[PDB]
Amino acid sequence: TDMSPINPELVQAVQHVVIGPSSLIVHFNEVIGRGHFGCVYHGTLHCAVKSLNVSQFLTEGIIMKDFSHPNVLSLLGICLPLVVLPYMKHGDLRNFIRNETHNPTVKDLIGFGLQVAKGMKYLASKKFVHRDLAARNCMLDEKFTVKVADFGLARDMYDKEYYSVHNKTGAKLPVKWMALESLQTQKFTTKSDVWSFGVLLWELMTRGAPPYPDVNTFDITVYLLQGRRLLQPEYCPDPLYEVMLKCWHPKAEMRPSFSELVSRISAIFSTFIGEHYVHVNATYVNVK
Numbered sequence: 001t002d003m004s005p006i007n008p009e010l011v012q013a014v015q016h017v018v019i020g021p022s023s024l025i026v027h028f029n030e031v032i033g034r035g036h037f038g039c040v041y042h043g044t045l046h047c048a049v050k051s052l053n054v055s056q057f058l059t060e061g062i063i064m065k066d067f068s069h070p071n072v073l074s075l076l077g078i079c080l081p082l083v084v085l086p087y088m089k090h091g092d093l094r095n096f097i098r099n100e101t102h103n104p105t106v107k108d109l110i111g112f113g114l115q116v117a118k119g120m121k122y123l124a125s126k127k128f129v130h131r132d133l134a135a136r137n138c139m140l141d142e143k144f145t146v147k148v149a150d151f152g153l154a155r156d157m158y159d160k161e162y163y164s165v166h167n168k169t170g171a172k173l174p175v176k177w178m179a180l181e182s183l184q185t186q187k188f189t190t191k192s193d194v195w196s197f198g199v200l201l202w203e204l205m206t207r208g209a210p211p212y213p214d215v216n217t218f219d220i221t222v223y224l225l226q227g228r229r230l231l232q233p234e235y236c237p238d239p240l241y242e243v244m245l246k247c248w249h250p251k252a253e254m255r256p257s258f259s260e261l262v263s264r265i266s267a268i269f270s271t272f273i274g275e276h277y278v279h280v281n282a283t284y285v286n287v288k
């Protein structure tokens with residue numbers, strides 16, 4: 001790639017994941033939101049219930065139930081195809097930071113970024129590559145705990161705006177979040193998740209501005225290969241921007257591990273005291 005600029009076994013195994021039919025009330029009248037592979041509804045077990053369009057559904061549930069971490073969205077269970085997830089009071093992280101009625105500080109936003117890094121450190125330790133890390137795909141609960149979501153049976157295209165169709169393969173991909181090598185090969189790794197995490201940090205510090213306005217296709221590759229990266233946000237401290245630049249290192253192997261990112265971001269986080277309010281950039285308001 002160009003990196004220089006130019007079944008009894010499965011049935012017994014799924015017992016601890018399955019929820020009984022009469023121990024789950026799905027409120028189909030109350031719609032939370034729409035995805036490409038299923039609609040999400042309110043439910044009582046209080047939870048979020050995604051109704052999808054069989055062995056793979058059961059298998060995917062077992063793998064997902066094993067992932068347990070405070071910064072990763074847990075699976076409460078499955079039902080037969082219903083995916084029972086914990087309800088996130090404050091919705092997705094992007095809409096939360098964009099909301100004009102919220103008054104985040106620099107500390108708050110770096111804190112959210114640290115939480116995501118902890119979630120990804122856990123997932124990477126399980127050899128799980130996310131492939132679509134972005135603020136829209138993380139969620140926020142009633143204690144403002146950030147949960148990396150949009151994986152396993154919860155995987156979807158929740159905002160169709162930010163997925164572009166590759167002209168040869170037809171795969172709808174989040175090109176603005178993708179590593180330079182993934183744009184060229186459509187292969188994903190933990191090191192490409194790190195690139196995406198860098199873009200997510202940029203989203204946090206811009207309070208949810210779209211990365212690279214008007215560069216929406218795989219021609220982002222040409223743009224990047226001119227020798228470009230996302231600019232430093234006005235309220236992004238210098239050390240955090242240095243971290244973003246490390247996340248976007250041309251060589252995948254030279255990018256920091258999520259372990260390293262948790263370390264570095266924890267240090268930067270600890271220097272702030274909640275005195276710097278982050279305001280939205282006038283040139284990004286209403287921009288898609």
Ligand SMILES: O=C(Nc1cn2nc(Sc3nnc4ccccn34)ccc2n1)C1CC1
Binds near residue numbers: 033048154
């Ligand atoms: O909408 C609200 N709460 C809410 C919505 N969901 N949606 C899901 S489904 C799902 N899984 N991963 C993602 C990633 C991004 C979007 C959806 N995702 C799971 C829990 C949940 N809680 C509150 C009213 C603001």
Ligand SMILES: [Cl-]
Binds near residue numbers: 105273
């Ligand atoms: Cl602050």
